[PDB]
Amino acid sequence: AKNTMPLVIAYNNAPEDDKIQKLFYLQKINYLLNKTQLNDDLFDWINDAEEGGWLNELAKFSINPNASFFLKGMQFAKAITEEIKNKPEINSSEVNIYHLMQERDQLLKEVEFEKCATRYAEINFLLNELALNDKKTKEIVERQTEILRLVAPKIKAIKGESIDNLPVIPSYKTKELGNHVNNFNFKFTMSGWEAPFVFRVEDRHELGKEQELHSYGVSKYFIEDYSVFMMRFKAEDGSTVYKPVILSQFANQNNLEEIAKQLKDGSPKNIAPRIGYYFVQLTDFCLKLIETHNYHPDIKLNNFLVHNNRVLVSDRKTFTTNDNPLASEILTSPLFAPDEFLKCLLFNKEGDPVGYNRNALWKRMNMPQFMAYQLGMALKQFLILTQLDELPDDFRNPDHSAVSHFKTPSRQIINLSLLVQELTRLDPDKRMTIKQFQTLLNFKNLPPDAFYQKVEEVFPSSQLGIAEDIEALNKVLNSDLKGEALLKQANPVFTKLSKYDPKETRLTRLAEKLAIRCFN
């Protein structure tokens, strides 16, 4: 609510030989406008181009107000480095750009200039050194700078567009109808670039979460954004609302759901290796997101774009920093949500969520185990969609595995189907973790029996409470008896296994190998 006024005062009061202090307060204000809901007056302030205005003063330092989080940071770093007189110890091979960005953002978040001026200058110096001497960083800055230069007229035309003529976007949590059409989400190409670009309008009034994530390694899985700015829209009431407009490349391969459906009409031996390629990215993204103390409660195949065979995410409105939130504090899709979430909802006839029940007032989700379940259902939907045109009605039934929809499954499909069951157990504390899943993906070519042994080494069955019955099935399987004579020493353990409220997959698998030996 326009909390920037003490920093405008400090900027004005700063001596003008000390332009590093000036730049520190410009970046501090900028870090705070990204966390601030815009009202009518603050919009015109951040859009003031004449002298005394926010935009006019950023132009003085060659800083683009519409630049992406990363490139606006590097433009600050370039301006600050023009003013530093004491040069730090140059060490490029020892520098991590994400660590520099994170520690810079913590300074802008809560630290006064007197307590951090020198470290604030050295961090920006190191950032600029990467832009000058690191080929990777230099070409990123060169590409975003050029794109931002070629799309400047479109940006001013968007800002220059009438508000009575600006669109109202209706709300819906779906994908069957697809993306709603407004004037801004139309593909286009710029002269000299074969790839098409697109503007997107997000359903949010501030980019506070977006700003934290772009300094973390997990942002590698974000579609590259080239421009960001708030825009006026019309609300349901007709009043003015403020939403971010973000420019990025158009993802040329739709999403992961459509990628799986294309595998139906390809060579079958390609399915399991390609699942490895895609899910190695999904798994690394999840672990990297969890490392930042952020969590994704709406994991599903169609929520992950694919562009140049790279799995990417653009819907980050649902990310939360809360590892143990209540059911009403997260957005998710009920078809892929774990049962601990579904037990907090009420349903009408045919099973549609219509609200929350008593449980939603106290029941919390463990987001890492929540994500493991959804990642498991993403693998299950992927596997099934390579065999069927639509998802089957028994898709949420854990007793109906993904491999049960394969007519001629290979070993890798059998092993991947087992991973689904390990990730989607009912008890969240007994689900395979995403880290364990990441370890086992590299062993998917193992013979099914050897792969089951690998799962036992990674995720021991003792930690599921089934160790008592594992020795009961192993005792009979280690016996020399065969045929019906073995079956009556296997009858007691069999009936003990049919008395399970949810069937434990690991016991269902060992009982069958024991059932085979009984039939002769």
Partner 1 sequence: NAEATLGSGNLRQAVMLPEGEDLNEWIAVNTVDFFNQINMLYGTITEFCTEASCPVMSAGPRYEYHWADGTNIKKPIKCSAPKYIDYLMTWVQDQLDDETLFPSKIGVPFPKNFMSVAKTILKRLFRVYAHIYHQHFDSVMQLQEEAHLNTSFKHFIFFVQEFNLIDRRELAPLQELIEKLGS
Sign of CA dihedral 482, 483, 488, 493: positive
78 lines the binding site for partner 1 (CB under 8 A): no
Pick one of 16, 17, 85, 136: the residue that binds partner 1 (CB under 8 A).
136
Burial of 28 (0-12, 13-18, 19+ CB in 10 A): buried
Name which of 270 and 491 has its Cβ closer to partner 1: 270
CA distances, 52 to each of 24, 36, 61 (Å): 18, 21, 14
Scanning 165-173, 267-275, 343-351, 500-508 for contacts with partner 1 by CB under 8 A, the matching segment is 267-275
Name which of 91 and 165 has its Cβ closer to partner 1: 91
- Max CA separation in the chain (angstroms): 95
Burial of 104 (0-12, 13-18, 19+ CB in 10 A): buried
DSSP string, 153-187: HHHHHHHTS-STTS--------SSS-PPP-TT---
What is the edge-to-edge ordering of all strands in the sheet holding 225-234?
197-201, 240-249, 225-234
280 lines the binding site for partner 1 (CB under 8 A): yes
Taking a C-beta distance cutoff of 8 angstroms, is the pair 243, 231 a contact? Answer: yes
DSSP 103: H
- Helix (H), strand (E) at residue 241: strand 240-249
Q: How many residues bind partner 1 (CB under 8 A)?
A: 40
Residues composing the chain? 520
Q: Could you list the beta-strand ranges (E) of 267-420.
A: 305-307, 310-312, 345-347, 353-356
CB of 208 to partner 1, least distance (A): 24
Pick one of 72, 104, 274, 425: the residue that binds partner 1 (CB under 8 A).
274
CB of 215 to partner 1, least distance (A): 14
Name which of 103 and 339 has its Cβ closer to partner 1: 103
CB of 38 to partner 1, least distance (A): 31
Closest CA to 375 of 444, 423, 340: 423
Q: Which residues contact 447 (CB under 8 A, 6 or more apart)?
A: 411
Cα separation, 436 vs 433, whole angstroms: 5
Burial of 455 (0-12, 13-18, 19+ CB in 10 A): buried
Pick one of 277, 347, 500, 519: the residue that binds partner 1 (CB under 8 A).
277
Name which of 53 and 276 has its Cβ closer to partner 1: 276
CB of 316 to partner 1, least distance (A): 16
269: tokens are 């031996």
Name which of 322 and 410 has its Cβ closer to partner 1: 410
Any known ligand binding at 315? yes
Scanning 21-29, 149-157, 274-282, 423-431 for contacts with partner 1 by CB under 8 A, the matching segment is 274-282
255: tokens are 């999403």
CB of 463 to partner 1, least distance (A): 19
Give the footprint of partner 1 on residues 213-232 (CB under 8 A). 220
Helix, strand or coil, per DSSP, at residue 245: strand
Any known ligand binding at 394? no
Q: Which residues contact 418 (CB under 8 A, 6 or more apart)?
A: 401, 448, 451, 452, 455, 505, 509
CB of 287 to partner 1, least distance (A): 6
CB of 280 to partner 1, least distance (A): 7
Pick one of 445, 461, 479, 508: the residue that binds partner 1 (CB under 8 A).
445
Pick one of 450, 467, 485, 515: the residue that binds partner 1 (CB under 8 A).
450
Closest CA to 143 of 74, 80, 57: 74
CB of 410 to partner 1, least distance (A): 7
Give the footprint of partner 1 on residues 294-313 (CB under 8 A). 308-310
CB of 221 to partner 1, least distance (A): 8
Name which of 63 and 126 has its Cβ closer to partner 1: 126
Neighbours of 43 (CB within 10 A): 14
Give the footprint of partner 1 on residues 395-414 (CB under 8 A). 410-412
Pick one of 99, 143, 154, 496: the residue that binds partner 1 (CB under 8 A).
143
Name which of 139 and 394 has its Cβ closer to partner 1: 139
Name which of 135 and 358 has its Cβ closer to partner 1: 135
Pick one of 273, 392, 483, 492: the residue that binds partner 1 (CB under 8 A).
273
Taking a C-beta distance cutoff of 8 angstroms, is the pair 490, 472 a contact? Answer: no
269 lines the binding site for partner 1 (CB under 8 A): yes
Name which of 259 and 473 has its Cβ closer to partner 1: 259
Scanning 7-15, 53-61, 132-140, 182-190 for contacts with partner 1 by CB under 8 A, the matching segment is 132-140
Pick one of 43, 229, 395, 443: the residue that binds partner 1 (CB under 8 A).
443
CA distances, 405 to each of 300, 417, 418, 449, 503 (Å): 20, 10, 13, 21, 19
Pick one of 17, 51, 176, 194: the residue that binds partner 1 (CB under 8 A).
194
Taking a C-beta distance cutoff of 8 angstroms, is the pair 73, 104 a contact? Answer: yes
441 lines the binding site for partner 1 (CB under 8 A): yes
282: tokens are 């999904």
Name which of 103 and 284 has its Cβ closer to partner 1: 284
Footprint of partner 1 (CB under 8 A) = 93, 134-136, 139-140, 143, 194-195, 220, 267, 269-270, 272-274, 276-277, 280-281, 283-284, 287, 308-310, 410-412, 435, 438-443, 445-447, 450
